[PDB]
Swiss-Prot record:
The active site is at residues 19, 21. This is Pseudouridine-5'-phosphatase. GO terms for molecular function: metal ion binding; phosphatase activity; pseudouridine 5'-phosphatase activity. The keyword rRNA-binding does not apply. Induction: Inhibited by low concentrations of calcium. Its EC number is 3.1.3.96. The lineage of its organism: Eukaryota, Metazoa, Chordata, Craniata, Vertebrata. Belongs to the HAD-like hydrolase superfamily. CbbY/CbbZ/Gph/YieH family. Its cofactor is Mg(2+). One of its GO terms (biological process) is nucleotide metabolic process. One of its GO terms (cellular component) is cytosol. It catalyses: psi-UMP + H2O = pseudouridine + phosphate. InterPro entries: Gpp1/Gpp2-like, HAD-like_sf, HAD-SF_hydro_IA, HAD_2, HAD_sf, PGP-like_dom2.
C-alpha cells in the first residue's frame, strides 16, 4: 500500500468520521453527468477546470459561475431548477466508492467507533442513501448539513466538531480522524484539531492536497495501523 503524501507524522486515533459525498459515495460523478448533459445542449464542456471553480460553492453561486464561464443563455435560477430536477432522478443510483465497504466492516469487527458527517441536508441524503440503508445503519450517528448544532458550513469546523461531540462518551478532538475528498473538508477537519485522510479526485491539483495528514489515491490504500488501529487480517 502506497500513499501520495503525508503532511505530518500520523498520531494514534480512537474515533473516525467519514464525509459522505465524494468519499463514501460517487456523487461527484453524478453531478458531472448531469451538468455535462445540460452543457452538451450548448456544445460546451463541463471540464475539470470549470468544476474546480464551483467546488465548495452553494448551488445558485455555482450556477452563476458555470453560466458566466461557459456563456450559457439561461438564468442561474433556471439552471439550478433543471439540474436539481435531474439530480433527484440520478441520486438514488449513487454507488459506494472503492474500499469503503471493506473499511467499514473492518471497523465494525474491531469495535472502532465511527460516524458520518455530510454537507447534504435530509432530502438529498435520503435520495443518495436510498439503496444503501444497511450500510448507512452501521455508523454510530449521522450529522447532516442542516443540523441544529452546525451554525456554519465547511471550511468552518462546526460539522466535524458536532460529529465528534455526538459520540457517547465524546473523545478529545485530537483523537478523531476525518476522511474527506475535498479541500473545504480538509480545511474544516484541520481547523477542528483533527487529523485528516484525503482521497481526492485524481484531477485535483496537488497544490490543493498539501495540508492533509495523509493523501491516498483510493480508500483501498488506507492502512489503519498507521493511526494505531488494527491492521487488516
Ligand atoms: Cl470533466
Ligand atoms: Cl445549496
Ligand atoms: Cl442538499
Ligand atoms: Cl455557511
Ligand atoms: K466531500
Amino acid at each position: 500500500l502506497y500513499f501520495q503524501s503525508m503532511a505530518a507524522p500520523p498520531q494514534p486515533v480512537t474515533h473516525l468520521i467519514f464525509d459522505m459525498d465524494g468519499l463514501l459515495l460517487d456523487t461527484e460523478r453524478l453531478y458531472s453527468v448531469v451538468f455535462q448533459e445540460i452543457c452538451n445542449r450548448y456544445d460546451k464542456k463541463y471540464s475539470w477546470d470549470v468544476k474546480s471553480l464551483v467546488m465548495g460553492k452553494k448551488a445558485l453561486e455555482a450556477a452563476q459561475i458555470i453560466i458566466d464561464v461557459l456563456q450559457l443563455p439561461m438564468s442561474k435560477e433556471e439552471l439550478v431548477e433543471e439540474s436539481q430536477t435531474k439530480l433527484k432522478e440520478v441520486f438514488p443510483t449513487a454507488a459506494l466508492m472503492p474500499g469503503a465497504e471493506k473499511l467499514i466492516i473492518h471497523l465494525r469487527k474491531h469495535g472502532i467507533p465511527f460516524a458520518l458527517a455530510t454537507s447534504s441536508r435530509s432530502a438529498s441524503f435520503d435520495m443518495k442513501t436510498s439503496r444503501h440503508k444497511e450500510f448507512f445503519s452501521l455508523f454510530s450517528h449521522i450529522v447532516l448539513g442542516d443540523d441544529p448544532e452546525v451554525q456554519h458550513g465547511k471550511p468552518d469546523p462546526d460539522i466535524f466538531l458536532a460529529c465528534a461531540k455526538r459520540f457517547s462518551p465524546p473523545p478529545a478532538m485530537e483523537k478523531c480522524l476525518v476522511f474527506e475528498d475535498a479541500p473545504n473538508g480538509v480545511e474544516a477537519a484541520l481547523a477542528a484539531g483533527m487529523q485528516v485522510v484525503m482521497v481526492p479526485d485524481g484531477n485535483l491539483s496537488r497544490d490543493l492536497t498539501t495540508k492533509a495528514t495523509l493523501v491516498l489515491n483510493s480508500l483501498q490504500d488506507f492502512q489503519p495501523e498507521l493511526f494505531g488501529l488494527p491492521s487488516y487480517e
